[PDB]
Scaffold this active site. Structure first.
Site, PDB file in Angstrom:
ATOM      1  N   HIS A  41       0.823  -1.243   0.000  1.00  0.00           N
ATOM      2  CA  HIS A  41       0.000   0.000   0.000  1.00  0.00           C
ATOM      3  C   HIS A  41       0.854   1.291   0.000  1.00  0.00           C
ATOM      4  CE1 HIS A  41      -0.073  -0.377   4.584  1.00  0.00           C
ATOM      5  NE2 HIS A  41       0.071   0.949   4.446  1.00  0.00           N
ATOM      6  N   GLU A  72       0.811  -8.414   0.786  1.00  0.00           N
ATOM      7  CA  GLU A  72       1.014  -7.018   1.272  1.00  0.00           C
ATOM      8  C   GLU A  72       2.501  -6.723   1.496  1.00  0.00           C
ATOM      9  OE1 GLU A  72      -1.426  -5.089   1.063  1.00  0.00           O
ATOM     10  OE2 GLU A  72      -0.460  -3.295   1.936  1.00  0.00           O
ATOM     11  N   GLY A 146       1.199   5.747  11.066  1.00  0.00           N
ATOM     12  CA  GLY A 146       2.656   6.006  11.064  1.00  0.00           C
ATOM     13  C   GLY A 146       3.487   4.807  11.517  1.00  0.00           C
ATOM     14  N   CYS A 148       3.213   1.744   9.888  1.00  0.00           N
ATOM     15  CA  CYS A 148       3.301   0.788   8.748  1.00  0.00           C
ATOM     16  C   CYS A 148       4.749   0.680   8.266  1.00  0.00           C
ATOM     17  CB  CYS A 148       2.348   1.139   7.614  1.00  0.00           C
ATOM     18  SG  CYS A 148       0.630   0.835   8.109  1.00  0.00           S
TER      19      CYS A 148
END
Length: 182
Positions: A41, A72, A146, A148
């Site tokens: 992402h 992911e 914040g 990730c």
């Protein structure tokens, strides 16, 4: 404070950079040579900022399992003048549950942040922001924006990167040794 935080600190000091894309600032884990990982992402393009320096992306691969399900994890090869310490021997070989994990973050917003998240479950399937995702690790900490790309470690293993949370639990994508054979 103790040997959990000691292993985490050693990974953060040598094997992390601050990556900025058009979607924000992320903790990025360097694995070996010029190869790093970031949550998919982050939407990595042709150019990324690494510690606020313009860096060409030589390759970027958004990993999926053999069922064509999102994992992911994006593996990025950076046109950088320096190699990462090789930490592939700290990666697990198999999907597993863990005790006593630390989530470590280093950004402009959250410098030198270490969170004891405790027990980690092999959750498996998660609908992550509407995307079916596999190989998800779950921990019971109320993780926030914040975090990730944050590295999840035990003593002696690098087990995942933080990809999301629901206000009560945090979620990491698994790192496996087999992602970084070459």
């Amino acid at each position: 404070m103790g040997p959990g935080f000691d292993f985490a600190q050693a990974i953060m000091k040598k094997n992390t950079v601050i990556a900025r894309t058009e979607k924000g600032e992320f903790t990025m884990l360097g694995v070996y040579d010029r190869v790093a990982v970031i949550p998919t992402h982050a939407s990595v393009g042709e150019i990324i900022y690494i510690n606020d320096v313009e860096t060409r992306v030589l390759d970027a691969c958004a990993l999926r399992d053999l069922t064509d399900t999102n994992l992911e994890i994006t593996i990025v090869k950076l046109d950088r003048n320096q190699k990462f310490r090789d930490i592939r021997h700290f990666l697990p070989r198999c999907e597993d549950d863990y005790n006593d994990a630390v989530l470590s973050v280093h950004t402009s917003k959250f410098p030198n942040m270490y969170i004891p998240v405790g027990q980690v479950t092999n959750y498996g399937f998660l609908n992550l922001g509407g995307t079916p995702t596999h190989r998800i690790l779950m921990y019971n900490f109320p993780t926030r924006a914040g975090q990730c790309g944050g590295v999840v470690t035990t003593t002696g293993k690098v087990i995942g990167i933080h990809v999301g949370g629901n206000g009560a639990q945090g979620f990491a994508a698994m790192l496996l040794h087999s992602y970084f054979t070459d």
